[PDB]
Amino acid sequence: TMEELARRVGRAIERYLNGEINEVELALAVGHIFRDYGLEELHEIVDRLLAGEISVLEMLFRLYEAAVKLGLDDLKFVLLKAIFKL
Amino acid sequence: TMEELARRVGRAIERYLNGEINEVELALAVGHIFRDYGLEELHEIVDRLLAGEISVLEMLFRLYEAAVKLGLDDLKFVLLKAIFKL
Amino acid sequence: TMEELARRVGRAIERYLNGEINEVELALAVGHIFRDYGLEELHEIVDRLLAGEISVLEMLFRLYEAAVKLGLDDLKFVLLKAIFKL
Ligand SMILES: [Zn+2]
Ligand SMILES: [Zn+2]
Ligand SMILES: [Zn+2]
């Protein structure tokens, strides 16, 4: 469900923010999570992060905009809390 | 082939045990290997490891239980040896 | 487009050579890039790197041969520069 998606993305971002995983690990993990649920635009945003064209804050902003366009309410709160933590 | 799958999974786990790769790298690599061979339940178990809901030992235990119902004998030996190393 | 593919592969190899990512991260990233563009032989070569049967130089060599067979010209230049940087 979309609750487990939000929980997993929030957990991955939490491990990134505590220093347990680095930027490439975060990119790979979050892109895999997004691909496993069928959301490809978010996967493209994480692909842009993985390449290096954007940073974590930019990726979070574009992910929040895409979630707004997709109506993923549980993921919007996770992304906003992550944005304010950075 | 199933022997090559067992060889690659064993090599990845041996890399993790020595200290060459960490938990996230091992999760991503083993999930990729399992997805490349069409074993989806094993992929879900490695996904739970990547999320953070289980550890390496628990993942090995559930992987062995799932490989028992699949008839992957070489993978069973690989997982048993990896379990006893831990 | 094949220009974006070559750009991303060159960028990933450049991060590897600068030392900001390691061998497993490079393998995962380059395999993901190759799979996202529908090139499977390149993906198999990167998979062989991921397991540990070949190193980065050998992978770059076989990737160059595969790109010669596929007629991808920008990838050839990227791989040649990466080979000579090693
Ligand atoms: Zn991708
Ligand atoms: Zn998965
Ligand atoms: Zn693969």
What's the number of CA atoms in the CB half-sphere (13 Å) around residue B84?
5
Q: How far apart are the first and last CA of chain A?
A: 27
Per-residue exposure over A54-71, b if at least 16 CB sit within 10 Å of its own CB, e if not:
bebeebbebbbebbeeee
Query: How far does the CA of residue A54 sit from the closest CA of chain B (Å)?
Result: 22
Stated resolution in angstroms: 2.8
Query: Tokens 């890399």, residue?
Result: B15
Query: How far does the CA of residue A52 sit from the closest CA of chain C (Å)?
Result: 8
Ligand 3 centroid, distance to C27 Cα (angstroms): 10
Q: 3-state SS of chain A: helix, strand, coil percent to 5?
A: 80, 0, 20
Cα separation of B12 and B31, whole Å? 11
Identify the chains in contact with B, defined as 3+ C-beta pairs within 8 A.
A, C
Q: How far apart are the first and last CA of chain C?
A: 27
Per-domain residue ranges for chain C? 2-85
Instruction: Pinpoint the alpha helices (H) of C36-72.
Output: 40-51, 56-70
CA distances for A70 relative to A25, A63, A84, B84, angstroms: 25, 10, 21, 46
H-helix or E-strand containing A26? Answer: helix A23-35
Cα separation of B13 and A83, whole Å? 35
Ligand 2 centroid, distance to B54 Cα (angstroms): 15
CA distances for A41 relative to A38, A70, A80, B7, C31, angstroms: 9, 10, 18, 35, 20
The residues placing their C-beta within 5 Å of ligand 1, an ion, are: A 47; C 36
